[PDB]
Write an enzyme that holds these catalytic residues in place. Structure first.
Site, PDB file in Angstrom:
ATOM      1  N   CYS A  67       0.821  -1.212   0.000  1.00 50.96           N
ATOM      2  CA  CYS A  67       0.000   0.000   0.000  1.00 50.96           C
ATOM      3  C   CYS A  67       0.861   1.272   0.000  1.00 50.96           C
ATOM      4  O   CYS A  67       1.801   1.389   0.771  1.00 50.96           O
ATOM      5  CB  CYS A  67      -0.894   0.028   1.229  1.00 50.96           C
ATOM      6  SG  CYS A  67      -2.025   1.407   1.280  1.00 50.96           S
ATOM      7  N   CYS A  76      -2.470  -0.058   9.011  1.00 48.51           N
ATOM      8  CA  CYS A  76      -1.531  -1.191   8.982  1.00 48.51           C
ATOM      9  C   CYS A  76      -0.238  -0.839   9.689  1.00 48.51           C
ATOM     10  O   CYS A  76       0.262   0.316   9.587  1.00 48.51           O
ATOM     11  CB  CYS A  76      -1.205  -1.571   7.539  1.00 48.51           C
ATOM     12  SG  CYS A  76      -2.624  -2.330   6.690  1.00 48.51           S
ATOM     13  N   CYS A 148      -6.381   0.400  -1.045  1.00 46.69           N
ATOM     14  CA  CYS A 148      -6.265  -0.239   0.255  1.00 46.69           C
ATOM     15  C   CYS A 148      -6.276  -1.749  -0.009  1.00 46.69           C
ATOM     16  O   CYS A 148      -7.344  -2.359  -0.117  1.00 46.69           O
ATOM     17  CB  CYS A 148      -7.434   0.160   1.129  1.00 46.69           C
ATOM     18  SG  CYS A 148      -7.401  -0.505   2.772  1.00 46.69           S
ATOM     19  N   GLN A 251     -17.939 -10.525  12.131  1.00 45.79           N
ATOM     20  CA  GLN A 251     -16.521 -10.804  12.016  1.00 45.79           C
ATOM     21  C   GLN A 251     -16.021 -10.254  10.702  1.00 45.79           C
ATOM     22  O   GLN A 251     -16.736 -10.273   9.695  1.00 45.79           O
ATOM     23  CB  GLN A 251     -16.233 -12.297  12.114  1.00 45.79           C
ATOM     24  CG  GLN A 251     -16.594 -12.953  13.506  1.00 45.79           C
ATOM     25  CD  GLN A 251     -15.672 -12.608  14.685  1.00 45.79           C
ATOM     26  OE1 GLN A 251     -14.549 -12.049  14.531  1.00 45.79           O
ATOM     27  NE2 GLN A 251     -16.167 -12.937  15.898  1.00 45.79           N
ATOM     28  N   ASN A 285     -23.463 -15.734  15.123  1.00 46.01           N
ATOM     29  CA  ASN A 285     -22.368 -16.263  14.329  1.00 46.01           C
ATOM     30  C   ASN A 285     -21.946 -17.672  14.757  1.00 46.01           C
ATOM     31  O   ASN A 285     -21.844 -18.560  13.912  1.00 46.01           O
ATOM     32  CB  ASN A 285     -21.145 -15.332  14.439  1.00 46.01           C
ATOM     33  CG  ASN A 285     -20.015 -15.770  13.526  1.00 46.01           C
ATOM     34  OD1 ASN A 285     -20.235 -16.043  12.335  1.00 46.01           O
ATOM     35  ND2 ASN A 285     -18.784 -15.798  14.058  1.00 46.01           N
ATOM     36  N   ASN A 328     -26.603  -7.370  30.134  1.00 44.17           N
ATOM     37  CA  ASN A 328     -25.315  -6.708  30.231  1.00 44.17           C
ATOM     38  C   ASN A 328     -24.439  -7.653  31.004  1.00 44.17           C
ATOM     39  O   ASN A 328     -24.654  -7.799  32.204  1.00 44.17           O
ATOM     40  CB  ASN A 328     -25.446  -5.417  31.031  1.00 44.17           C
ATOM     41  CG  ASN A 328     -24.110  -4.688  31.185  1.00 44.17           C
ATOM     42  OD1 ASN A 328     -23.068  -5.264  31.006  1.00 44.17           O
ATOM     43  ND2 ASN A 328     -24.167  -3.417  31.501  1.00 44.17           N
ATOM     44  N   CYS A 375      -9.963 -11.332  20.852  1.00 45.99           N
ATOM     45  CA  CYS A 375      -9.241 -10.454  19.940  1.00 45.99           C
ATOM     46  C   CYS A 375      -8.303  -9.574  20.765  1.00 45.99           C
ATOM     47  O   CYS A 375      -7.808  -8.574  20.301  1.00 45.99           O
ATOM     48  CB  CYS A 375     -10.250  -9.672  18.998  1.00 45.99           C
ATOM     49  SG  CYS A 375     -11.479  -8.612  19.904  1.00 45.99           S
TER      50      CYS A 375
HETATM   51  N1  LIG Z   1     -21.150  -5.926  28.723  1.00 41.98           N
HETATM   52  C1  LIG Z   1     -21.579  -6.637  27.673  1.00 41.98           C
HETATM   53  N2  LIG Z   1     -22.738  -7.366  27.832  1.00 41.98           N
HETATM   54  C2  LIG Z   1     -23.290  -8.123  26.815  1.00 41.98           C
HETATM   55  N3  LIG Z   1     -22.677  -8.105  25.558  1.00 41.98           N
HETATM   56  C3  LIG Z   1     -21.535  -7.412  25.394  1.00 41.98           C
HETATM   57  C4  LIG Z   1     -20.944  -6.680  26.435  1.00 41.98           C
HETATM   58  N4  LIG Z   1     -19.813  -6.106  25.916  1.00 41.98           N
HETATM   59  C5  LIG Z   1     -19.688  -6.489  24.644  1.00 41.98           C
HETATM   60  N5  LIG Z   1     -20.742  -7.274  24.304  1.00 41.98           N
HETATM   61  C6  LIG Z   1     -20.984  -7.959  23.060  1.00 41.98           C
HETATM   62  O1  LIG Z   1     -19.916  -8.860  22.810  1.00 41.98           O
HETATM   63  C7  LIG Z   1     -19.851  -9.064  21.383  1.00 41.98           C
HETATM   64  C8  LIG Z   1     -18.410  -9.203  20.882  1.00 41.98           C
HETATM   65  S1  LIG Z   1     -18.346  -9.301  19.080  1.00 41.98           S
HETATM   66  C9  LIG Z   1     -18.544 -11.097  18.778  1.00 41.98           C
HETATM   67  C10 LIG Z   1     -20.002 -11.440  18.471  1.00 41.98           C
HETATM   68  C11 LIG Z   1     -20.374 -12.803  17.896  1.00 41.98           C
HETATM   69  N6  LIG Z   1     -19.810 -13.805  18.802  1.00 41.98           N
HETATM   70  C12 LIG Z   1     -19.834 -12.941  16.485  1.00 41.98           C
HETATM   71  O2  LIG Z   1     -18.977 -13.841  16.249  1.00 41.98           O
HETATM   72  O3  LIG Z   1     -20.248 -12.229  15.561  1.00 41.98           O
HETATM   73  C13 LIG Z   1     -20.619  -7.886  20.709  1.00 41.98           C
HETATM   74  O4  LIG Z   1     -21.747  -8.377  19.995  1.00 41.98           O
HETATM   75  C14 LIG Z   1     -20.966  -6.996  21.917  1.00 41.98           C
HETATM   76  O5  LIG Z   1     -22.171  -6.305  21.889  1.00 41.98           O
HETATM   77  S1  SF4 Z   2      -5.559   0.283   6.112  1.00 39.77           S
HETATM   78 FE1  SF4 Z   2      -5.521   0.236   3.886  1.00 39.77          FE
HETATM   79  S2  SF4 Z   2      -4.934   2.335   3.218  1.00 39.77           S
HETATM   80 FE2  SF4 Z   2      -4.315   2.014   5.336  1.00 39.77          FE
HETATM   81  S3  SF4 Z   2      -2.190   1.201   5.265  1.00 39.77           S
HETATM   82 FE3  SF4 Z   2      -3.488  -0.629   5.348  1.00 39.77          FE
HETATM   83  S4  SF4 Z   2      -3.852  -1.269   3.195  1.00 39.77           S
HETATM   84 FE4  SF4 Z   2      -3.092   0.938   3.221  1.00 39.77          FE
END
Ligand SMILES: Nc1ncnc2c1ncn2[C@@H]1O[C@H](CSCC[C@H](N)C(=O)O)[C@@H](O)[C@H]1O
Ligand code: SF4
Length: 418
Positions: A67, A76, A148, A251, A285, A328, A375
């Site tokens: 890039c 990046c 990008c 994701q 998911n 929550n 993550c």
């Molecule tokens: N305090 C909290 N209570 C309930 N959910 C929460 C939270 N903090 C974060 N989250 C939820 O945690 C998730 C992480 S993202 C992953 C989501 C799903 N497992 C997938 O694979 O797509 C989000 O959807 C977010 O809203």
């Molecule tokens: S996010 Fe995209 S525009 Fe930015 S450095 Fe990475 S490849 Fe390049």
RNA sequence: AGCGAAAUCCUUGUCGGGUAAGUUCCGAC
């Protein structure tokens, strides 16, 4: 002032690490087994940061960044490091944090992987011009983005088009950002705008969207999402088709996502009589694929629109053995519905902040296996400790290269008890 | 400025714990 240095580590955040006078020294742009002249920018008690003046050696794992905005765009961190070096360094960080070695790397394509992106917009009053791109690291400055190579091909190709369309609008002083998502069903664009679009601006955006086969969404504020064109969107997870909320989380790497979900399911070894709990489940998911195997699945999520998408997903796919709760998970969780009933398997996939509130309750549910997707490995390590003092053991540990060329890593761990 | 901010980037500061004189974790002002 100009200091000398030999780098023998790449942190998971993409900078080379050396020592001067015992002190840790972090240098962006330097790779393990490179020597260089450098100088010091931030100089704290326990560490210093520095930038290269003359690089003096090349590593065989050094790459020419793909890039032209690399080094200026903050998106990046390590396009200069081979994919192999990245995976080796990320999985070494993960092993150290987890005190366990990494038994597998899960990966897909190194370029063109990102299916969800948010571009910042700014009008530059000096010129007549719209800025569209990503921020400089640590800054509010926008870098104008022409290419990008980490974006999925259908999104990267849209960049010059979106720029052109948005810069021809009257409301162009008043655009906040533009989100692009590439789903199996088609490409979506969400325009967040801070003042109303005239009917002229709307006509241009509608025409543009139909021209490019995009679904167009307008967000005039935080609570409204106007669908202007397109059908319910969806992606394929493990051969199921899953709808989602366009402004909310999915994701971001399709190919790694497929592999993750399928591996998570293999790791959980779901029996037809298993009662399964999926915490931080989003739009389902993982939950729906688990539902094709389990007697019973319970999903728990904080965002209402994701809970309701999980529900709509179960209905759409004829899955009657799954319930979604809106909670929550940082509040007193013992008082929550999911907390009062038995489970054999638990999967959790929390945000970067991790799952501190839930670990003790997961322990009282007494599951035979736990798969934790993360993550953020410092928070996984923190939460993991409690499982280990409760007599769970780490059976497998995977580094997942969900974010090539960034300083971010995905991981997944399987815990089983004695 | 504005947008976003239970987020690839999307930045307050200072100090402390942890840590590899190690940035992520955690805590105070
Ligand atoms: N305090 C909290 N209570 C309930 N959910 C929460 C939270 N903090 C974060 N989250 C939820 O945690 C998730 C992480 S993202 C992953 C989501 C799903 N497992 C997938 O694979 O797509 C989000 O959807 C977010 O809203
Ligand atoms: S996010 Fe995209 S525009 Fe930015 S450095 Fe990475 S490849 Fe390049």
């Amino acid at each position: 002032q100009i200091i000398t240095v030999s780098v023998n580590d790449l942190d998971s955040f993409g900078q080379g690490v050396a020592r001067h006078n015992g002190k840790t020294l972090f240098i962006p742009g330097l790779l393990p087994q490179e020597n260089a002249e450098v100088t010091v920018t931030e100089d704290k008690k326990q560490y210093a940061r520095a930038k290269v003046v003359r690089r003096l050696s090349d590593s065989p794992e050094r790459e020419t960044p793909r890039c032209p905005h690399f080094g200026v765009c903050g998106g990046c961190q390590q396009q200069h490091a081979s994919v192999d070096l990245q995976q080796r360094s990320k999985s070494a960080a993960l092993a150290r944090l987890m005190k366990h070695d990494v038994s597998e790397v899960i990966a897909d394509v190194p370029w063109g992987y990102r299916r969800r992106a948010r571009l910042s917009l700014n009008y530059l009053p000096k010129t007549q011009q719209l800025q569209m791109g990503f921020r400089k690291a640590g800054s509010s400055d926008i870098v104008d983005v022409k290419q990008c190579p980490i974006l999925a091909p259908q999104l990267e190709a849209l960049l010059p088009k979106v720029r052109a369309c948005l810069g021809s609008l009257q409301a162009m002083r008043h655009l906040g950002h533009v989100e692009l998502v590439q789903a199996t069903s088609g490409t979506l664009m969400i325009l967040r705008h801070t003042a109303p679009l005239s009917s002229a601006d709307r006509e241009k955006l509608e025409r543009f969207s139909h021209s490019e086969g995009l679904d167009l969404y307008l967000a005039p504020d935080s609570e409204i999402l106007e669908t202007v064109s397109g059908e319910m969107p969806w992606y394929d997870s493990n051969g199921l088709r899953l709808t989602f909320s366009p402004r909310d989380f999915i994701q971001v790497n399709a190919g790694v996502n497929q592999k993750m979900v399928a591996r998570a399911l293999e790791w959980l070894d779901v029996q037809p009589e298993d009662r399964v709990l999926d915490l931080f489940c989003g739009m389902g998911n993982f939950t729906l694929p688990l539902a094709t195997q389990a007697a019973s699945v319970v999903g728990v999520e904080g965002v209402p629109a994701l809970v309701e998408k999980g529900q709509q997903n179960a209905r759409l796919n004829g899955l009657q053995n799954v319930t979604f709760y809106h909670e929550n998970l940082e509040e007193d969780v013992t008082k929550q519905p999911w907390a009062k009933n038995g489970f054999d398997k638990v999967l959790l996939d929390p945000a970067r902040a991790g799952a501190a509130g839930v670990m003790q309750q997961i322990i009282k549910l007494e599951p035979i296996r736990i798969v934790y997707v993360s993550c953020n490995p410092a928070t996984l390590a923190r939460d993991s400790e409690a499982l280990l003092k409760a007599g769970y053991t780490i059976a497998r540990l995977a580094m997942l290269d969900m974010f090539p060329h960034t300083g971010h890593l995905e991981s997944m761990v399987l815990f089983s008890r004695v």
